[PDB]
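Q: What would this complex look like in 3D?
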Amino acid sequence: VLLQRISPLQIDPTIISNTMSTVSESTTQTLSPASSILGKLRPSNSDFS
Amino acid sequence: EVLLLPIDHQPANVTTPTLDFTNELTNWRARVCELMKNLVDNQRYQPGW
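A: Here is my prediction, written as structure tokens for the whole assembly.
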């Protein structure tokens, strides 16, 4: 909590979702690596502490 | 008795204008699209597609 006020960087909320739109797939597939990422990791600012 | 232009001037031959592909800005648009063709020709610069 003391380094919280000192450190300049905060989380950028949209790096992960602004990525994975450069690459895509056919909708015919049932597996999705990008939604696998967004179901796997949840940023939520509770990661940060 | 002179004005200065950023692009090249050339007077028209006829008074009924019609389409041609022989001028400086079409040559420019052509060279830009030729670079983008050379950029899409490699798949290192876009590995996802």
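A: To summarize the key features: Helices of chain B lie at 24-41. Residues 38 and 44 of chain B are 12 Å apart (CA to CA).
Q: Very helpful, thank you.
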